[PDB]
Ligand binder design. Sequence first.
Ligand SMILES: Nc1ncnc2c1ncn2[C@@H]1O[C@H](COP(=O)(O)OP(=O)(O)OP(=O)(O)O)[C@@H](O)[C@H]1O
Length: 229
Amino acid sequence: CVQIIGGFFTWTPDGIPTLSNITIRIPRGQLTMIVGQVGCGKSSLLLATLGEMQKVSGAVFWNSNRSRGPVAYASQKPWLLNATVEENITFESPFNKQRYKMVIEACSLQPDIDILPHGDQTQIGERGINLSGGQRQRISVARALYQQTNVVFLDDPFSALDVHLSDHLMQAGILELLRDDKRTVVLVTHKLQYLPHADWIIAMKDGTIQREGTLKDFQRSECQLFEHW
Ligand SMILES: Nc1ncnc2c1ncn2[C@@H]1O[C@H](COP(=O)(O)OP(=O)(O)OP(=O)(O)O)[C@@H](O)[C@H]1O
């Protein structure tokens, strides 16, 4: 799907590229884990592949299985439309009882709605009943998974929740959704407990790509020693 050759990303409308020499691809039928340090150009790569940055020096050939499809996404900072929880998650799409139950189970929405006086009918966000960081992160994650897109981007949903139970439940739900729906995904986070197992990692470290390959290259780079310790 994703194809980048020149690899230029610039927030300034002229000069000073924040991400350069990035030559990576994200082929369809995949579940990509993203591994990298803090502030090394991780979310910038996701936005550049989305086409929300100045594409000055590089090529972007997009085609699903250069035309863009409705790619699902959820930024690191979440976003909760001031409406009901059902509308905040379905997001102007047809409502199905089967898939809503599956999503609300994997995303742990029944315990969450219990913390609310209405749940699937309460108001949330600005000018509404307040929320918590974990609840907002999980609500955003559910909306990305329920939208039935050719891809699904999860910008650090595991980092948001310190608890291991929520992280393990979310990881199991992501695996189940990807296996039972056959849709690509990409998790941009720092949770290395699963990335070298059955994911095709790609590292853009210190403002440039290090290696864009499969899990085989993880045994030929001498870098996962800290992830396994
Ligand atoms: N929206 C933006 N506007 C301006 N500069 C940006 C923006 N996003 C990223 N940058 C710049 O590009 C750099 C790359 O950041 P990067 O993508 O690694 O962030 P991150 O690891 O996702 O962030 P965080 O620490 O919040 O989790 C940033 O340090 C910043 O200098």
